[PDB]
Amino acid sequence: GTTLDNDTQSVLLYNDGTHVRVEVCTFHFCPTPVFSASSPHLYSSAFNCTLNYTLASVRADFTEVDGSFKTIREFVFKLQDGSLNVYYASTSYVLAIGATSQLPSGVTPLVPLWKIPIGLNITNFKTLVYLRSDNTPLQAAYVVG
Amino acid sequence: NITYGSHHLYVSSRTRGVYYPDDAFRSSTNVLH
Amino acid sequence: AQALNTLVKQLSSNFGAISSVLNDIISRLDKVEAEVQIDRLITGRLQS
Amino acid sequence: NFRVQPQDTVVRFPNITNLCPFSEVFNATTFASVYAWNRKRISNCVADYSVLYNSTSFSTFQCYGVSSTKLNDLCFTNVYADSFVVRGDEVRQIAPGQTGVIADYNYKLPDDFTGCVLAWNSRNQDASTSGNFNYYYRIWRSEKLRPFERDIAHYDYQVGTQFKSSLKNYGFYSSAGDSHQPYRVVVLSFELLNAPATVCGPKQSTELIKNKCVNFNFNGLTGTGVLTDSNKKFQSFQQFGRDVSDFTDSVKDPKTLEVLDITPCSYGGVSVITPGTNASTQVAVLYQD
Amino acid sequence: YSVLYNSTSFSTFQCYGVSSTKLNDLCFTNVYADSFVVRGDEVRQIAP
Ligand SMILES: *[C@@H]1O[C@H](CO)[C@@H](O[C@@H]2O[C@H](CO)[C@@H](O[C@@H]3O[C@H](CO[C@H]4O[C@H](CO)[C@@H](O)[C@H](O[C@H]5O[C@H](CO)[C@@H](O)[C@H](O)[C@@H]5O)[C@@H]4O)[C@@H](O)[C@H](O)[C@@H]3O)[C@H](O)[C@H]2NC(C)=O)[C@H](O)[C@H]1NC(C)=O
Ligand SMILES: C=CC1=C(C)/C(=C/c2[nH]c(/C=C3N=C(/C=C4\NC(=O)C(C)=C4C=C)C(C)=C\3CCC(=O)O)c(CCC(=O)O)c2C)NC1=O
Numbered sequence A: 001g002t003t004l005d006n007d008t009q010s011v012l013l014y015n016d017g018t019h020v021r022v023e024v025c026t027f028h029f030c031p032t033p034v035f036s037a038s039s040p041h042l043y044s045s046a047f048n049c050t051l052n053y054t055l056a057s058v059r060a061d062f063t064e065v066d067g068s069f070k071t072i073r074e075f076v077f078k079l080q081d082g083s084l085n086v087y088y089a090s091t092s093y094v095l096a097i098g099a100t101s102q103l104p105s106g107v108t109p110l111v112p113l114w115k116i117p118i119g120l121n122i123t124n125f126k127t128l129v130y131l132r133s134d135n136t137p138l139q140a141a142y143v144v145g
Numbered sequence B: 001n002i003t004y005g006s007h008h009l010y011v012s013s014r015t016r017g018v019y020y021p022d023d024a025f026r027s028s029t030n031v032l033h
Numbered sequence C: 001a002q003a004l005n006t007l008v009k010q011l012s013s014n015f016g017a018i019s020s021v022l023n024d025i026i027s028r029l030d031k032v033e034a035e036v037q038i039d040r041l042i043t044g045r046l047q048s
Numbered sequence D: 001n002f003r004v005q006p007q008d009t010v011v012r013f014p015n016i017t018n019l020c021p022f023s024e025v026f027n028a029t030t031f032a033s034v035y036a037w038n039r040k041r042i043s044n045c046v047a048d049y050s051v052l053y054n055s056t057s058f059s060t061f062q063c064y065g066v067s068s069t070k071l072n073d074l075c076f077t078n079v080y081a082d083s084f085v086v087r088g089d090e091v092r093q094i095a096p097g098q099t100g101v102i103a104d105y106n107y108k109l110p111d112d113f114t115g116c117v118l119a120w121n122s123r124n125q126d127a128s129t130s131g132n133f134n135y136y137y138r139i140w141r142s143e144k145l146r147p148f149e150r151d152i153a154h155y156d157y158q159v160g161t162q163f164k165s166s167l168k169n170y171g172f173y174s175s176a177g178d179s180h181q182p183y184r185v186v187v188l189s190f191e192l193l194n195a196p197a198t199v200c201g202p203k204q205s206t207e208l209i210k211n212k213c214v215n216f217n218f219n220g221l222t223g224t225g226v227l228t229d230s231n232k233k234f235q236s237f238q239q240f241g242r243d244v245s246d247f248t249d250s251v252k253d254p255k256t257l258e259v260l261d262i263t264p265c266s267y268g269g270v271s272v273i274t275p276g277t278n279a280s281t282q283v284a285v286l287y288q289d
Numbered sequence E: 001y002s003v004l005y006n007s008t009s010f011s012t013f014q015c016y017g018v019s020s021t022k023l024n025d026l027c028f029t030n031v032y033a034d035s036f037v038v039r040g041d042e043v044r045q046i047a048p
């Protein structure tokens, strides 16, 4: 979105656990939008909502996995004529917990996944994560370029 | 709600973010885009 | 020297476009009808 | 060079059993306001459009990036239908490279727009004797809209020293003049011959003929060549393949999802050997290759 | 010309030698305004 509050429309693209849903609605967002216990704690309300459908049916659980980092999931988001184009590729990347933080070497091409007709001005974005039942963040990392 | 503090670094992108620029199949070629 | 100076002087040719200056075409027209004039200039300058 | 003429015709379209919702997008009970224009996703349907000849007629049918007469033989990728109500004199603003209140602040088309713009007079459906005030348009935005961008937020703006709403009400009266009468506008946007498609014209696709010079038609892309089985693996977002020149040398068949190589029919150097005219009429032909 | 958005609507607006979207970023030399009244079917005759 642009201001990420209830005077403008915002795009809500996320995985609820069984599906990938995109919602372009006017969200009264929480001060920190975050999943708590595989339950949405993202917005208080959403009224003027122009787009609401599921993009894909993938089974992503909310279970903590012990050990080191296993995979890297890379995304490219770009706006082209009012549509949000998503490019995606996932690669096996074994990175230790206390190791030096760096991106993998080589080239992994990202395939075009979706073209979402949001029809919005996008100047800012925020990341949605999930915590444990006691609202404690998990072991993860994300990169923005 | 959450007051756990933040942590940010500045790593380099070592040839990451390459995507297919079009939907055309190509093989055994070098293409400018 | 004459070949290089003739190459310099031939940039003033319109080549059938509304102007020989790219800046004039870009300033007057949007990117649907500036494109044809720019393409005419590109073809002419590549020919030169 | 030795030419081989095509003998058969191969048409391969994806198998679609449904007509496109022409009555849903052209005969809808309500149309959106132009500032809050509705976009409808169109997929897995046959774009016949000759079923509209019986009932409806259009004042504007400008098409961009494609000829109107070629629409029946094509397949369309990423089809959207944008519907709104605009005034009669603002219909011409629904075009690429236009300025005006609608094009700046309500609905902007791309400069490289591919698609068709449809419009028809919507009096006695959106106009009343006492006046219809259910349609709104933006009057000010502080920034011109980007193509296919929508702004439905409610905010005020400063006119002199007071603050007025940026949304202005359409006054649609019966017998108000054709320039001030309501018009329903449908904008169809798509891309052609570059990606897998699910919306196609009525073409009655035929069987696959291989190892012969045929006139093919794959998802609207016509041509002449020889179809052969290919050991190419398309990556499920690709429909056509290109060689080092921009030439379609392979295609994914839309019914059986296998890749077929496309090979030109004409090949091989040919030269003729003759003595002089008025010495002989016999010739010898050297078929290289 | 955006002050006319509140009150005035034009059934015909065609620009020659310049894109209409480029009018806000340009300066104009020797500007004249010719005004008259014709019939409805004679508006098409006001063109080169
Ligand atoms: C698209 O995304 C962007 C980002 O959110 C949104 O548009 C931009 O929003 C930003 C804020 O983040 C604006 O930035 C500020 O805007 C002001 C511009 O000042 C104009 O408006 C004032 C009040 O409306 C007015 O006083 C002022 O007048 C001045 O200029 C006049 C001539 O223009 C002159 O007559 C006057 O004397 C006076 O000098 C201006 O008209 C201002 O506070 C700051 O300077 C700053 O720029 C941007 O303006 C917005 N972008 C653009 C290109 O204008 C936008 O909402 C998003 N869209 C959606 C749907 O969310
Ligand atoms: C939110 C966006 C999102 C995207 C872009 C996405 C794409 C995506 N995720 C997949 C698998 C998957 N990807 C994930 C999980 C994720 N991968 C992610 O990109 C993210 C953010 C998660 C976690 C929420 C898992 C667990 C699977 C399923 C693997 C399987 O079923 O074998 C696949 C492969 C599907 C297949 O091979 O049939 C795609 C295309 N999944 C998503 O959830």
Ligand SMILES: *[C@@H]1O[C@H](CO)[C@@H](O[C@@H]2O[C@H](CO)[C@@H](O)[C@H](O)[C@H]2NC(C)=O)[C@H](O)[C@H]1NC(C)=O
Residues within 6 Å of the ligand: A023, A025, A046, A049, A052, A053
């Ligand atoms: C988008 O659509 C989904 C699916 O219809 C909505 O989720 C439903 O919300 C209602 C009301 O809270 C629940 O009773 C249903 O159980 C939900 N269904 C599913 C499948 O989760 C969702 O609320 C919509 N989003 C909006 C309006 O912002």
Ligand SMILES: *[C@@H]1O[C@H](CO)[C@@H](O[C@@H]2O[C@H](CO)[C@@H](O)[C@H](O)[C@H]2NC(C)=O)[C@H](O)[C@H]1NC(C)=O
Residues within 6 Å of the ligand: D023, D027, D055, D056
């Ligand atoms: C568009 O919808 C209207 C309203 O349903 C249709 O008008 C009806 O047409 C039928 C068939 O001619 C008549 O029997 C009804 O009396 C009409 N009115 C109503 C209120 O139902 C109209 O025909 C539709 N047009 C198309 C092309 O489907």
Ligand SMILES: *[C@@H]1O[C@H](CO)[C@@H](O[C@@H]2O[C@H](CO)[C@@H](O)[C@H](O)[C@H]2NC(C)=O)[C@H](O)[C@H]1NC(C)=O
Residues within 6 Å of the ligand: D139, D140, D159, D160, D161, D162, E002, E003, E004, E005, E006, E007
């Ligand atoms: C809306 O229309 C009004 C007139 O109906 C315009 O407001 C006037 O604008 C002039 C400058 O052109 C100012 O000097 C006046 O003070 C304004 N009038 C009042 C009563 O304040 C206005 O420009 C239009 N607004 C738009 C097009 O955004």
Ligand SMILES: CCCCC/C=C/C/C=C/CCCCCCCC(=O)O
Residues within 6 Å of the ligand: D099, D100, D101, E001, E004, E008, E009, E010, E013, E023, E028, E031, E033
């Ligand atoms: C008093 C006229 C002064 C002319 C100055 C030089 C001309 C440059 C501006 C030309 C635009 C004139 C108004 C066009 C309004 C279009 C709005 C619409 O599409 O409805």
Ligand SMILES: *[C@@H]1O[C@H](CO)[C@@H](O)[C@H](O)[C@H]1NC(C)=O
Residues within 6 Å of the ligand: A005, A006, A028, A045
């Ligand atoms: C919109 O957000 C403001 C600021 O947080 C809040 O006071 C108001 O109640 C919200 N309104 C709605 C309808 O959500």
Ligand SMILES: *[C@@H]1O[C@H](CO)[C@@H](O)[C@H](O)[C@H]1NC(C)=O
Residues within 6 Å of the ligand: A047, A048, D036, D152
């Ligand atoms: C936006 O929401 C407001 C408040 O609910 C409503 O009055 C208005 O009509 C809505 N606008 C739309 C749906 O375009």
Ligand SMILES: *[C@@H]1O[C@H](CO)[C@@H](O)[C@H](O)[C@H]1NC(C)=O
Residues within 6 Å of the ligand: D015, D254, D255, D256
């Ligand atoms: C229809 O197309 C599908 C595409 O998956 C294909 O599997 C199927 O065989 C086709 N139907 C017929 C009758 O050929």
